[PDB]
Amino acid sequence: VVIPSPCCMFFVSKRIPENRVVSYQLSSRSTCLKAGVIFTTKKGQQSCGDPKQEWVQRYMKNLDAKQKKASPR
């Protein structure tokens, strides 16, 4: 699983509910909204997650563990 670097135009007003988020997309460049991550919801939304926050990090943690875990549902 590899992601390029999708950018947005506004940081999430707040964290997100893990029960709605599905996966994030890391973005890095000096032309977008600074350096942060992008989280998509299940409904099909995509909000920019702030790395300084603990939910993008707390999320990236359980999201990176999928490497050794294989649960489709």
Side-chain angles (χ1 to χ4, degrees):
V1 175
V2 54
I3 177 283
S5 160
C7 293
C8 57
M9 62 129 157
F10 77 122
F11 247 133
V12 288
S13 36
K14 277 220 106 147
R15 62 101 130 74
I16 336 185
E18 199 209 73
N19 225 337
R20 289 217 152 245
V21 185
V22 282
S23 176
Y24 70 87
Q25 282 154 322
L26 266 180
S27 188
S28 44
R29 248 153 98 199
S30 224
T31 48
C32 299
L33 220 120
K34 237 181 170 121
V37 189
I38 293 93
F39 278 68
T40 294
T41 336
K42 246 236 123 124
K43 254 182 188 249
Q45 243 287 269
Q46 179 224 140
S47 78
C48 253
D50 171 21
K52 294 235 210 227
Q53 291 282 284
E54 244 173 331
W55 68 265
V56 180
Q57 246 153 316
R58 170 189 247 174
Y59 279 25
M60 234 156 281
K61 257 206 198 160
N62 199 94
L63 274 144
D64 261 300
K66 182 140 81 124
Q67 187 136 27
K68 64 116 65 155
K69 227 104 202 147
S71 233
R73 201 210 233 135

Short mmCIF file of all heavy atoms in Angstrom, two decimals:
data_model
loop_
_atom_site.label_atom_id
_atom_site.label_comp_id
_atom_site.label_asym_id
_atom_site.label_seq_id
_atom_site.Cartn_x
_atom_site.Cartn_y
_atom_site.Cartn_z
N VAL A 1 0.86 -1.22 0.00
CA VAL A 1 0.00 0.00 0.00
C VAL A 1 0.88 1.25 0.00
O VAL A 1 1.65 1.48 0.91
CB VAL A 1 -0.82 -0.08 1.29
CG1 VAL A 1 -1.65 1.19 1.45
CG2 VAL A 1 -1.75 -1.29 1.23
N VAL A 2 0.77 2.07 -1.01
CA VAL A 2 1.61 3.31 -1.07
C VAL A 2 0.75 4.50 -1.49
O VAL A 2 -0.11 4.41 -2.33
CB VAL A 2 2.69 3.01 -2.11
CG1 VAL A 2 2.04 2.58 -3.42
CG2 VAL A 2 3.53 4.27 -2.34
N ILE A 3 0.99 5.63 -0.88
CA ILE A 3 0.21 6.85 -1.20
C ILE A 3 1.16 7.96 -1.66
O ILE A 3 2.22 8.15 -1.09
CB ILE A 3 -0.47 7.19 0.13
CG1 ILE A 3 -1.28 8.50 0.00
CG2 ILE A 3 0.57 7.30 1.24
CD1 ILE A 3 -0.37 9.74 0.03
N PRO A 4 0.75 8.68 -2.68
CA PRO A 4 1.59 9.79 -3.20
C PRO A 4 1.60 10.96 -2.22
O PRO A 4 2.43 11.04 -1.34
CB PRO A 4 0.92 10.16 -4.52
CG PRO A 4 -0.50 9.71 -4.38
CD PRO A 4 -0.50 8.54 -3.43
N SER A 5 0.67 11.88 -2.34
CA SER A 5 0.64 13.04 -1.40
C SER A 5 -0.53 13.98 -1.75
O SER A 5 -0.31 15.04 -2.31
CB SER A 5 1.97 13.76 -1.59
OG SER A 5 1.86 15.10 -1.11
N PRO A 6 -1.72 13.56 -1.42
CA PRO A 6 -2.92 14.38 -1.71
C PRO A 6 -2.94 15.61 -0.79
O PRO A 6 -2.71 15.52 0.39
CB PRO A 6 -4.08 13.45 -1.40
CG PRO A 6 -3.54 12.46 -0.43
CD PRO A 6 -2.07 12.30 -0.74
N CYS A 7 -3.21 16.77 -1.34
CA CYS A 7 -3.25 18.00 -0.50
C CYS A 7 -4.69 18.48 -0.29
O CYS A 7 -5.61 17.99 -0.92
CB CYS A 7 -2.45 19.04 -1.30
SG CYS A 7 -0.71 18.54 -1.36
N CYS A 8 -4.88 19.43 0.58
CA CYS A 8 -6.26 19.94 0.83
C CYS A 8 -6.24 21.47 0.94
O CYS A 8 -5.32 22.12 0.47
CB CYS A 8 -6.68 19.31 2.16
SG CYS A 8 -5.49 19.75 3.45
N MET A 9 -7.24 22.06 1.53
CA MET A 9 -7.27 23.54 1.65
C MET A 9 -7.69 23.97 3.07
O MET A 9 -8.03 25.11 3.30
CB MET A 9 -8.30 24.01 0.62
CG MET A 9 -9.67 23.44 0.98
SD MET A 9 -10.89 24.78 1.01
CE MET A 9 -12.36 23.75 0.72
N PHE A 10 -7.68 23.06 4.01
CA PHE A 10 -8.08 23.42 5.40
C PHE A 10 -7.83 22.24 6.35
O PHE A 10 -8.14 21.11 6.04
CB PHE A 10 -9.58 23.77 5.31
CG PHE A 10 -10.42 22.51 5.22
CD1 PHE A 10 -11.41 22.27 6.18
CD2 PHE A 10 -10.22 21.60 4.18
CE1 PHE A 10 -12.20 21.11 6.09
CE2 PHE A 10 -11.01 20.44 4.09
CZ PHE A 10 -12.00 20.20 5.05
N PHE A 11 -7.27 22.50 7.50
CA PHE A 11 -7.00 21.39 8.46
C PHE A 11 -8.30 20.98 9.15
O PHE A 11 -9.19 21.78 9.36
CB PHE A 11 -6.02 21.97 9.48
CG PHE A 11 -4.69 21.26 9.34
CD1 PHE A 11 -3.51 22.01 9.30
CD2 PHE A 11 -4.64 19.87 9.26
CE1 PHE A 11 -2.27 21.35 9.18
CE2 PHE A 11 -3.41 19.21 9.13
CZ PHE A 11 -2.23 19.96 9.10
N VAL A 12 -8.42 19.73 9.51
CA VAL A 12 -9.66 19.26 10.20
C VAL A 12 -9.98 20.17 11.39
O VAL A 12 -9.13 20.49 12.19
CB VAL A 12 -9.34 17.85 10.69
CG1 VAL A 12 -9.30 16.89 9.51
CG2 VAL A 12 -7.99 17.84 11.42
N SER A 13 -11.22 20.57 11.53
CA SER A 13 -11.59 21.44 12.68
C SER A 13 -11.26 20.70 13.98
O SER A 13 -11.01 21.30 15.00
CB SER A 13 -13.09 21.66 12.55
OG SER A 13 -13.70 20.47 12.06
N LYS A 14 -11.26 19.39 13.93
CA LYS A 14 -10.94 18.59 15.14
C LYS A 14 -10.52 17.18 14.72
O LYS A 14 -10.46 16.87 13.55
CB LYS A 14 -12.23 18.55 15.96
CG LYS A 14 -12.34 19.83 16.80
CD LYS A 14 -12.89 19.47 18.18
CE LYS A 14 -11.76 19.55 19.21
NZ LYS A 14 -12.41 20.01 20.47
N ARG A 15 -10.24 16.32 15.66
CA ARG A 15 -9.83 14.94 15.29
C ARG A 15 -10.97 14.22 14.57
O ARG A 15 -11.84 14.85 13.99
CB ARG A 15 -9.51 14.25 16.62
CG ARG A 15 -10.78 14.22 17.48
CD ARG A 15 -11.41 12.83 17.41
NE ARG A 15 -11.64 12.43 18.82
CZ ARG A 15 -12.61 12.97 19.51
NH1 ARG A 15 -13.80 13.08 18.99
NH2 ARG A 15 -12.38 13.40 20.72
N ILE A 16 -10.98 12.92 14.59
CA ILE A 16 -12.07 12.16 13.90
C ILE A 16 -12.43 10.93 14.74
O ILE A 16 -11.68 10.55 15.62
CB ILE A 16 -11.51 11.72 12.53
CG1 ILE A 16 -10.36 12.63 12.07
CG2 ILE A 16 -12.64 11.76 11.49
CD1 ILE A 16 -9.91 12.27 10.65
N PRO A 17 -13.55 10.32 14.45
CA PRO A 17 -13.97 9.11 15.18
C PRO A 17 -13.43 7.87 14.45
O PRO A 17 -13.80 7.59 13.33
CB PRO A 17 -15.49 9.19 15.12
CG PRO A 17 -15.81 10.03 13.92
CD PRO A 17 -14.54 10.69 13.44
N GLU A 18 -12.55 7.14 15.08
CA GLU A 18 -11.97 5.93 14.42
C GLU A 18 -13.07 5.06 13.79
O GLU A 18 -12.85 4.38 12.81
CB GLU A 18 -11.27 5.16 15.54
CG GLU A 18 -10.26 4.19 14.93
CD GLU A 18 -10.08 2.99 15.86
OE1 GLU A 18 -10.98 2.17 15.92
OE2 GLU A 18 -9.04 2.90 16.48
N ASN A 19 -14.25 5.08 14.35
CA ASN A 19 -15.35 4.25 13.77
C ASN A 19 -15.77 4.79 12.40
O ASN A 19 -16.53 4.16 11.68
CB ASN A 19 -16.50 4.38 14.77
CG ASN A 19 -17.11 3.00 15.03
OD1 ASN A 19 -16.98 2.11 14.22
ND2 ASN A 19 -17.77 2.79 16.13
N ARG A 20 -15.29 5.95 12.02
CA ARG A 20 -15.68 6.52 10.70
C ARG A 20 -14.47 6.58 9.77
O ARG A 20 -14.58 6.44 8.57
CB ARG A 20 -16.17 7.92 11.02
CG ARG A 20 -17.52 7.83 11.74
CD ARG A 20 -18.42 8.97 11.28
NE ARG A 20 -19.81 8.45 11.43
CZ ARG A 20 -20.56 8.27 10.38
NH1 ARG A 20 -20.08 7.64 9.34
NH2 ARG A 20 -21.79 8.71 10.37
N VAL A 21 -13.31 6.80 10.32
CA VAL A 21 -12.09 6.88 9.46
C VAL A 21 -11.74 5.51 8.88
O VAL A 21 -12.01 4.49 9.49
CB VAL A 21 -10.97 7.35 10.39
CG1 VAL A 21 -9.71 7.60 9.56
CG2 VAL A 21 -11.39 8.65 11.08
N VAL A 22 -11.16 5.48 7.72
CA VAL A 22 -10.80 4.18 7.10
C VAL A 22 -9.29 4.10 6.85
O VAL A 22 -8.69 3.05 6.97
CB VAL A 22 -11.56 4.11 5.77
CG1 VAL A 22 -13.01 3.76 6.04
CG2 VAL A 22 -11.50 5.46 5.04
N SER A 23 -8.69 5.19 6.48
CA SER A 23 -7.23 5.18 6.19
C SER A 23 -6.75 6.59 5.87
O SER A 23 -7.50 7.41 5.38
CB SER A 23 -7.09 4.27 4.97
OG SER A 23 -5.74 4.25 4.55
N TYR A 24 -5.51 6.89 6.14
CA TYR A 24 -5.01 8.26 5.86
C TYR A 24 -4.08 8.28 4.63
O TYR A 24 -3.63 7.26 4.15
CB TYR A 24 -4.23 8.64 7.12
CG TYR A 24 -2.97 7.81 7.23
CD1 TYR A 24 -1.79 8.24 6.61
CD2 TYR A 24 -2.98 6.61 7.95
CE1 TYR A 24 -0.62 7.48 6.71
CE2 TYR A 24 -1.81 5.84 8.05
CZ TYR A 24 -0.63 6.28 7.43
OH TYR A 24 0.52 5.52 7.53
N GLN A 25 -3.80 9.46 4.14
CA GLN A 25 -2.89 9.61 2.97
C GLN A 25 -1.85 10.67 3.30
O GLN A 25 -2.15 11.84 3.43
CB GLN A 25 -3.79 10.08 1.82
CG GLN A 25 -4.57 8.89 1.26
CD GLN A 25 -5.87 9.39 0.63
OE1 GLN A 25 -6.50 10.29 1.14
NE2 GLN A 25 -6.30 8.83 -0.47
N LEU A 26 -0.62 10.27 3.49
CA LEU A 26 0.43 11.27 3.87
C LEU A 26 0.78 12.18 2.69
O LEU A 26 0.94 11.75 1.57
CB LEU A 26 1.64 10.43 4.29
CG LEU A 26 1.62 10.24 5.80
CD1 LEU A 26 2.84 9.42 6.23
CD2 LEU A 26 1.67 11.61 6.50
N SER A 27 0.93 13.45 2.97
CA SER A 27 1.29 14.43 1.91
C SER A 27 2.50 15.26 2.37
O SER A 27 2.56 15.69 3.50
CB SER A 27 0.06 15.32 1.75
OG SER A 27 0.24 16.17 0.63
N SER A 28 3.45 15.48 1.50
CA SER A 28 4.64 16.27 1.91
C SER A 28 5.07 17.23 0.79
O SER A 28 5.42 16.81 -0.30
CB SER A 28 5.74 15.24 2.18
OG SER A 28 5.73 14.27 1.14
N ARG A 29 5.05 18.51 1.05
CA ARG A 29 5.46 19.50 0.01
C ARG A 29 5.34 20.92 0.57
O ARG A 29 4.58 21.18 1.48
CB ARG A 29 4.48 19.30 -1.15
CG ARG A 29 5.24 18.72 -2.34
CD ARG A 29 4.27 17.91 -3.22
NE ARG A 29 3.89 18.84 -4.32
CZ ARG A 29 2.81 18.61 -5.01
NH1 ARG A 29 2.80 17.66 -5.91
NH2 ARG A 29 1.74 19.33 -4.81
N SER A 30 6.09 21.84 0.03
CA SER A 30 6.03 23.25 0.54
C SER A 30 5.03 24.06 -0.29
O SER A 30 5.10 25.27 -0.36
CB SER A 30 7.44 23.80 0.35
OG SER A 30 7.82 24.52 1.52
N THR A 31 4.09 23.40 -0.93
CA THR A 31 3.10 24.15 -1.75
C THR A 31 1.67 23.89 -1.25
O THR A 31 0.76 24.63 -1.55
CB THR A 31 3.27 23.59 -3.17
OG1 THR A 31 3.27 22.17 -3.12
CG2 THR A 31 4.59 24.09 -3.76
N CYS A 32 1.48 22.86 -0.48
CA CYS A 32 0.11 22.56 0.04
C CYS A 32 -0.09 23.22 1.41
O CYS A 32 0.62 24.13 1.79
CB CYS A 32 0.05 21.04 0.17
SG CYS A 32 0.30 20.29 -1.46
N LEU A 33 -1.06 22.77 2.16
CA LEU A 33 -1.31 23.37 3.50
C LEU A 33 -0.24 22.89 4.48
O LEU A 33 -0.52 22.16 5.42
CB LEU A 33 -2.69 22.86 3.92
CG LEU A 33 -3.46 23.99 4.62
CD1 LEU A 33 -4.74 24.29 3.85
CD2 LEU A 33 -3.81 23.56 6.04
N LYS A 34 0.98 23.29 4.28
CA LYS A 34 2.09 22.86 5.19
C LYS A 34 2.26 21.34 5.14
O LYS A 34 1.88 20.69 4.18
CB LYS A 34 1.67 23.30 6.59
CG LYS A 34 2.74 24.23 7.18
CD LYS A 34 2.33 24.64 8.59
CE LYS A 34 3.50 25.35 9.28
NZ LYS A 34 2.99 26.71 9.62
N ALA A 35 2.83 20.76 6.16
CA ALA A 35 3.02 19.28 6.16
C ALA A 35 2.06 18.61 7.15
O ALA A 35 2.13 18.82 8.34
CB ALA A 35 4.47 19.08 6.61
N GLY A 36 1.17 17.79 6.65
CA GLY A 36 0.21 17.10 7.56
C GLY A 36 -0.29 15.82 6.88
O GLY A 36 0.15 15.48 5.80
N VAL A 37 -1.21 15.11 7.49
CA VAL A 37 -1.71 13.87 6.84
C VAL A 37 -3.14 14.08 6.33
O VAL A 37 -3.75 15.09 6.61
CB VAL A 37 -1.68 12.79 7.92
CG1 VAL A 37 -1.96 11.43 7.29
CG2 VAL A 37 -0.31 12.76 8.60
N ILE A 38 -3.67 13.15 5.60
CA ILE A 38 -5.06 13.30 5.09
C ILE A 38 -5.87 12.07 5.48
O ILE A 38 -5.53 10.96 5.12
CB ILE A 38 -4.91 13.39 3.57
CG1 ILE A 38 -4.20 14.69 3.21
CG2 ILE A 38 -6.30 13.36 2.92
CD1 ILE A 38 -2.69 14.44 3.10
N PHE A 39 -6.94 12.24 6.21
CA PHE A 39 -7.74 11.05 6.61
C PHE A 39 -9.08 11.01 5.89
O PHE A 39 -9.77 12.00 5.78
CB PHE A 39 -7.93 11.18 8.11
CG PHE A 39 -6.70 10.67 8.81
CD1 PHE A 39 -5.49 11.38 8.69
CD2 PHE A 39 -6.75 9.50 9.56
CE1 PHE A 39 -4.34 10.90 9.33
CE2 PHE A 39 -5.60 9.02 10.19
CZ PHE A 39 -4.40 9.72 10.08
N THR A 40 -9.46 9.86 5.40
CA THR A 40 -10.75 9.74 4.69
C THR A 40 -11.76 9.01 5.58
O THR A 40 -11.42 8.11 6.32
CB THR A 40 -10.46 8.92 3.44
OG1 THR A 40 -9.59 9.66 2.58
CG2 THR A 40 -11.76 8.60 2.69
N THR A 41 -13.00 9.39 5.49
CA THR A 41 -14.04 8.71 6.31
C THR A 41 -14.67 7.57 5.51
O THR A 41 -14.33 7.34 4.37
CB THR A 41 -15.09 9.79 6.62
OG1 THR A 41 -14.49 11.08 6.54
CG2 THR A 41 -15.64 9.57 8.02
N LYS A 42 -15.57 6.84 6.11
CA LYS A 42 -16.22 5.71 5.38
C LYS A 42 -17.24 6.24 4.37
O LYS A 42 -17.43 5.69 3.31
CB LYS A 42 -16.91 4.88 6.46
CG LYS A 42 -16.25 3.50 6.56
CD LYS A 42 -17.30 2.41 6.36
CE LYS A 42 -16.89 1.52 5.19
NZ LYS A 42 -16.85 0.14 5.75
N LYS A 43 -17.90 7.31 4.70
CA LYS A 43 -18.91 7.88 3.77
C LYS A 43 -18.25 8.31 2.45
O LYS A 43 -18.89 8.45 1.43
CB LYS A 43 -19.48 9.10 4.49
CG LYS A 43 -20.89 8.79 5.00
CD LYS A 43 -21.47 10.03 5.68
CE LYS A 43 -22.79 9.67 6.37
NZ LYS A 43 -23.84 10.36 5.57
N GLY A 44 -16.96 8.51 2.47
CA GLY A 44 -16.25 8.93 1.23
C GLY A 44 -15.70 10.35 1.41
O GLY A 44 -15.50 11.07 0.45
N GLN A 45 -15.47 10.76 2.62
CA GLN A 45 -14.94 12.13 2.86
C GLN A 45 -13.41 12.10 2.96
O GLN A 45 -12.81 11.05 3.05
CB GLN A 45 -15.56 12.57 4.19
CG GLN A 45 -16.45 13.79 3.95
CD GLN A 45 -15.58 15.02 3.69
OE1 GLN A 45 -15.23 15.74 4.61
NE2 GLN A 45 -15.22 15.30 2.47
N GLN A 46 -12.78 13.24 2.96
CA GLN A 46 -11.29 13.28 3.06
C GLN A 46 -10.85 14.55 3.78
O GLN A 46 -10.71 15.60 3.19
CB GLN A 46 -10.80 13.29 1.61
CG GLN A 46 -9.27 13.35 1.59
CD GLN A 46 -8.82 14.37 0.54
OE1 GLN A 46 -7.89 15.11 0.76
NE2 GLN A 46 -9.45 14.43 -0.60
N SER A 47 -10.62 14.47 5.06
CA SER A 47 -10.19 15.68 5.83
C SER A 47 -8.69 15.62 6.12
O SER A 47 -8.13 14.56 6.37
CB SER A 47 -10.99 15.63 7.12
OG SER A 47 -10.41 14.68 8.00
N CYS A 48 -8.03 16.74 6.10
CA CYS A 48 -6.56 16.76 6.39
C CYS A 48 -6.32 16.55 7.89
O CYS A 48 -6.80 17.31 8.71
CB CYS A 48 -6.10 18.15 5.95
SG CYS A 48 -5.14 18.01 4.42
N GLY A 49 -5.59 15.53 8.26
CA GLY A 49 -5.34 15.30 9.70
C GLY A 49 -4.04 15.99 10.10
O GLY A 49 -3.07 16.00 9.37
N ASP A 50 -4.01 16.55 11.27
CA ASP A 50 -2.78 17.24 11.73
C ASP A 50 -1.89 16.24 12.49
O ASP A 50 -2.34 15.58 13.40
CB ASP A 50 -3.29 18.35 12.67
CG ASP A 50 -2.11 18.99 13.40
OD1 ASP A 50 -1.00 18.87 12.92
OD2 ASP A 50 -2.34 19.59 14.44
N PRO A 51 -0.64 16.16 12.08
CA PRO A 51 0.30 15.22 12.73
C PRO A 51 0.58 15.67 14.17
O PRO A 51 0.81 14.86 15.05
CB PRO A 51 1.56 15.30 11.87
CG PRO A 51 1.47 16.64 11.21
CD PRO A 51 0.00 16.91 11.00
N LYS A 52 0.53 16.95 14.42
CA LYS A 52 0.77 17.44 15.80
C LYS A 52 -0.32 16.88 16.73
O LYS A 52 -0.12 16.76 17.92
CB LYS A 52 0.68 18.96 15.71
CG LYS A 52 1.84 19.48 14.85
CD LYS A 52 2.62 20.53 15.64
CE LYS A 52 3.23 21.55 14.67
NZ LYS A 52 4.64 21.71 15.11
N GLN A 53 -1.45 16.54 16.18
CA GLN A 53 -2.55 15.98 17.02
C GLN A 53 -2.24 14.51 17.36
O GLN A 53 -1.42 13.88 16.71
CB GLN A 53 -3.81 16.08 16.16
CG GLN A 53 -4.19 17.55 16.00
CD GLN A 53 -4.89 18.04 17.27
OE1 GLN A 53 -6.04 17.73 17.50
NE2 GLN A 53 -4.23 18.79 18.11
N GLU A 54 -2.86 13.97 18.37
CA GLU A 54 -2.56 12.56 18.74
C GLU A 54 -3.50 11.57 18.03
O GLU A 54 -3.26 10.39 18.04
CB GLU A 54 -2.77 12.50 20.25
CG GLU A 54 -1.44 12.18 20.93
CD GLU A 54 -1.60 12.29 22.45
OE1 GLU A 54 -2.42 13.08 22.88
OE2 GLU A 54 -0.89 11.59 23.16
N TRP A 55 -4.55 12.03 17.40
CA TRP A 55 -5.45 11.07 16.71
C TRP A 55 -4.86 10.69 15.35
O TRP A 55 -4.94 9.55 14.94
CB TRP A 55 -6.81 11.77 16.59
CG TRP A 55 -6.75 12.92 15.64
CD1 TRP A 55 -6.56 14.21 16.01
CD2 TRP A 55 -6.92 12.93 14.20
NE1 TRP A 55 -6.60 15.01 14.87
CE2 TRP A 55 -6.82 14.26 13.74
CE3 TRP A 55 -7.15 11.92 13.25
CZ2 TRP A 55 -6.94 14.58 12.40
CZ3 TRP A 55 -7.27 12.24 11.89
CH2 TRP A 55 -7.17 13.57 11.46
N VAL A 56 -4.21 11.60 14.67
CA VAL A 56 -3.58 11.21 13.38
C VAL A 56 -2.47 10.22 13.73
O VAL A 56 -2.30 9.20 13.10
CB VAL A 56 -2.98 12.47 12.76
CG1 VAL A 56 -2.32 12.08 11.43
CG2 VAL A 56 -4.07 13.50 12.48
N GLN A 57 -1.73 10.53 14.77
CA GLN A 57 -0.64 9.62 15.22
C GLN A 57 -1.24 8.34 15.78
O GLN A 57 -0.94 7.25 15.34
CB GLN A 57 0.09 10.40 16.32
CG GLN A 57 1.50 10.75 15.86
CD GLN A 57 1.97 12.03 16.56
OE1 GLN A 57 1.23 12.98 16.68
NE2 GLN A 57 3.18 12.08 17.05
N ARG A 58 -2.13 8.46 16.73
CA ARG A 58 -2.79 7.26 17.31
C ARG A 58 -3.36 6.41 16.18
O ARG A 58 -3.34 5.20 16.20
CB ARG A 58 -3.91 7.81 18.20
CG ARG A 58 -4.82 6.68 18.67
CD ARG A 58 -6.05 7.26 19.36
NE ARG A 58 -5.92 6.85 20.79
CZ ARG A 58 -6.76 7.30 21.68
NH1 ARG A 58 -6.60 8.50 22.18
NH2 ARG A 58 -7.77 6.56 22.06
N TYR A 59 -3.87 7.07 15.17
CA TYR A 59 -4.45 6.34 14.01
C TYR A 59 -3.33 5.70 13.20
O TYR A 59 -3.30 4.51 12.98
CB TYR A 59 -5.15 7.41 13.18
CG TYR A 59 -6.52 7.74 13.75
CD1 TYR A 59 -6.81 7.54 15.11
CD2 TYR A 59 -7.50 8.27 12.90
CE1 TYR A 59 -8.08 7.86 15.60
CE2 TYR A 59 -8.77 8.58 13.39
CZ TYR A 59 -9.06 8.37 14.74
OH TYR A 59 -10.31 8.67 15.24
N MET A 60 -2.40 6.50 12.74
CA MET A 60 -1.27 5.95 11.93
C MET A 60 -0.66 4.73 12.63
O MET A 60 -0.10 3.86 12.00
CB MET A 60 -0.26 7.09 11.85
CG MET A 60 0.09 7.35 10.38
SD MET A 60 0.68 9.04 10.21
CE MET A 60 -0.95 9.80 10.24
N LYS A 61 -0.78 4.66 13.93
CA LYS A 61 -0.22 3.50 14.67
C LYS A 61 -1.05 2.25 14.37
O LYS A 61 -0.54 1.25 13.90
CB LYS A 61 -0.34 3.87 16.15
CG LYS A 61 1.03 4.30 16.68
CD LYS A 61 1.08 4.06 18.19
CE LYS A 61 2.23 4.87 18.79
NZ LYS A 61 1.91 4.98 20.24
N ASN A 62 -2.33 2.29 14.63
CA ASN A 62 -3.18 1.10 14.34
C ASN A 62 -3.25 0.87 12.83
O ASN A 62 -3.49 -0.23 12.37
CB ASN A 62 -4.56 1.46 14.90
CG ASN A 62 -5.38 0.18 15.09
OD1 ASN A 62 -5.40 -0.39 16.16
ND2 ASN A 62 -6.08 -0.29 14.09
N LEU A 63 -3.03 1.90 12.06
CA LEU A 63 -3.08 1.75 10.58
C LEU A 63 -1.79 1.09 10.07
O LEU A 63 -1.78 0.40 9.08
CB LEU A 63 -3.19 3.18 10.05
CG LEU A 63 -4.66 3.60 10.02
CD1 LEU A 63 -4.78 5.07 10.39
CD2 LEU A 63 -5.22 3.37 8.62
N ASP A 64 -0.70 1.31 10.75
CA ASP A 64 0.59 0.70 10.32
C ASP A 64 0.68 -0.75 10.81
O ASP A 64 1.41 -1.55 10.26
CB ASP A 64 1.67 1.56 10.97
CG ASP A 64 2.20 2.57 9.95
OD1 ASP A 64 2.72 2.14 8.94
OD2 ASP A 64 2.09 3.76 10.21
N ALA A 65 -0.05 -1.08 11.84
CA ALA A 65 -0.01 -2.48 12.36
C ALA A 65 -0.68 -3.44 11.37
O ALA A 65 -0.49 -4.64 11.44
CB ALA A 65 -0.78 -2.43 13.68
N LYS A 66 -1.45 -2.92 10.45
CA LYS A 66 -2.11 -3.81 9.46
C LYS A 66 -1.07 -4.68 8.75
O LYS A 66 -1.38 -5.72 8.20
CB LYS A 66 -2.79 -2.86 8.47
CG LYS A 66 -3.57 -3.67 7.43
CD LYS A 66 -4.90 -2.98 7.13
CE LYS A 66 -4.68 -1.84 6.13
NZ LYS A 66 -5.59 -2.14 5.00
N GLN A 67 0.17 -4.26 8.75
CA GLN A 67 1.23 -5.05 8.08
C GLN A 67 1.20 -6.51 8.56
O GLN A 67 1.22 -7.43 7.77
CB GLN A 67 2.54 -4.38 8.49
CG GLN A 67 3.71 -5.01 7.73
CD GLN A 67 4.64 -3.90 7.22
OE1 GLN A 67 4.70 -2.84 7.79
NE2 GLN A 67 5.36 -4.12 6.16
N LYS A 68 1.16 -6.71 9.85
CA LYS A 68 1.13 -8.11 10.38
C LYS A 68 -0.31 -8.58 10.60
O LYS A 68 -0.56 -9.73 10.89
CB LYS A 68 1.88 -8.04 11.72
CG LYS A 68 1.11 -7.14 12.69
CD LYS A 68 0.64 -7.97 13.89
CE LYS A 68 1.85 -8.47 14.68
NZ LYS A 68 1.34 -8.70 16.06
N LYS A 69 -1.27 -7.70 10.45
CA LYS A 69 -2.69 -8.12 10.65
C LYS A 69 -3.42 -8.21 9.31
O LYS A 69 -3.23 -7.39 8.43
CB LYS A 69 -3.31 -7.02 11.52
CG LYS A 69 -4.09 -7.65 12.67
CD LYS A 69 -3.28 -7.52 13.96
CE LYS A 69 -3.75 -8.58 14.97
NZ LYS A 69 -2.53 -8.93 15.74
N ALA A 70 -4.24 -9.21 9.14
CA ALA A 70 -4.98 -9.35 7.85
C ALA A 70 -6.48 -9.55 8.12
O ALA A 70 -7.00 -10.64 8.03
CB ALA A 70 -4.39 -10.60 7.19
N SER A 71 -7.17 -8.50 8.46
CA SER A 71 -8.63 -8.62 8.74
C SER A 71 -9.43 -7.70 7.81
O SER A 71 -9.48 -6.51 8.01
CB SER A 71 -8.80 -8.18 10.20
OG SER A 71 -9.49 -9.18 10.92
N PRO A 72 -10.04 -8.29 6.81
CA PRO A 72 -10.85 -7.50 5.84
C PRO A 72 -12.13 -7.00 6.50
O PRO A 72 -12.65 -5.95 6.15
CB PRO A 72 -11.16 -8.50 4.73
CG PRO A 72 -11.07 -9.84 5.38
CD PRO A 72 -10.05 -9.72 6.48
N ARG A 73 -12.66 -7.73 7.44
CA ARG A 73 -13.91 -7.28 8.12
C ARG A 73 -14.03 -7.95 9.50
O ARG A 73 -14.39 -7.25 10.44
CB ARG A 73 -15.04 -7.75 7.21
CG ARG A 73 -16.30 -6.93 7.50
CD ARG A 73 -17.54 -7.77 7.21
NE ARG A 73 -18.37 -6.95 6.29
CZ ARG A 73 -18.91 -7.50 5.23
NH1 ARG A 73 -20.06 -8.11 5.34
NH2 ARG A 73 -18.31 -7.42 4.08
#
